[PDB]
Design a protein around this ligand. Structure first.
Ligand code: NDP
Ligand code: D2N
Length: 206
């Protein structure tokens, strides 16, 4: 009664698995953010009458996002942090672990609640990504690959695109990415600001 959905991780990362610098992103990509927004917000139309997605994030990611952009708009935010500390949010949820967030979500958004959960995303940062990679329900990574070894000080925790992980994690066809995300998605290299990047979807078997 708690294991009733897969998790999806969404991340932008360099070819060296770099995700962050000096507690922020070290690139400026508005289209890449709009992608993150489309994907994390997308609900099939028939369901969209009553259903919403969830974004789970570490408290350091929470702080990292500019004040203007919180909570992240038409999704259910849950911030994961290990001491019932002092957050202070407009209906904004707190849990001490990934599984405690899941239980809090299923208790709050039940068979009867007006709002119903479609998909659940883990949106960072490295510490929460590491918990999600270890979680038996994670089966999908939405990766934006950034083809530049931009200096980072925080890294994604498991080299899921490298040969050692290649019997577990498989890159899907672009048409399957678009089928999952519900829209046409740019295919191949996109250039904003001196770097190529591209959108990928990886899966593993549960
Ligand atoms: N490129 C991308 O797509 C993304 C990049 N980022 C970047 O990542 C950096 C943040 O990464 P990181 O430093 O790991 O920060 P995290 O966001 O993972 O936050 C870490 C804090 O969240 C809490 N936490 C995380 N995992 C758990 C867990 N399993 N159980 C309990 N509490 C947990 C802890 O809080 P406490 O200390 O409260 O106990 C921990 O100290 C920033 O640079 C941000 O810009 C973030 C998201 C996406
Ligand atoms: C109120 C007006 O709102 C508007 O007009 C719309 C602006 C939309 C901004 C909100 O979305 C943002 C904004 C900034 C961010 O860090 C600056 C992030 C964190 C981020 C970014 N890329 C990301 N990209 C990927 N592939 N994955 C992530 N996990 C991710 C993550 C967590 C998200």
């Amino acid at each position: 009664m708690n294991q009733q959905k897969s998790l999806t991780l969404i991340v932008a990362l360099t070819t060296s698995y770099g995700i962050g610098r000096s507690n922020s992103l070290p690139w400026k990509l508005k289209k890449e953010i709009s992608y993150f927004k489309r994907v994390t917000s997308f609900v099939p139309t028939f369901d969209s009458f009553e259903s919403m997605n969830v974004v789970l994030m570490g408290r350091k990611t929470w702080e990292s996002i500019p004040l203007q952009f919180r909570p992240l708009k038409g999704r259910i935010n849950v911030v994961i942090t290990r001491n019932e500390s002092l957050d202070l949010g407009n209906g904004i949820h707190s849990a001490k672990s990934l599984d405690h967030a899941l239980e809090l979500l299923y208790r709050t958004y039940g068979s009867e609640s007006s709002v119903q959960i479609n998909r659940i995303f883990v949106i960072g940062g490295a510490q929460l990504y590491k918990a999600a990679m270890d979680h038996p329900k994670l089966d999908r990574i939405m990766a934006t690959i950034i083809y530049k070894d931009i200096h980072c000080d925080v890294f994604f925790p498991l080299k899921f695109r490298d040969k050692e992980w290649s019997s577990v994690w498989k890159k899907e066809k672009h048409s399957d990415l678009e089928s999952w995300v519900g829209t046409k998605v740019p295919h191949g290299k996109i250039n904003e600001d001196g770097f190529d990047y591209e959108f990928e979807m990886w899966t593993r078997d549960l």
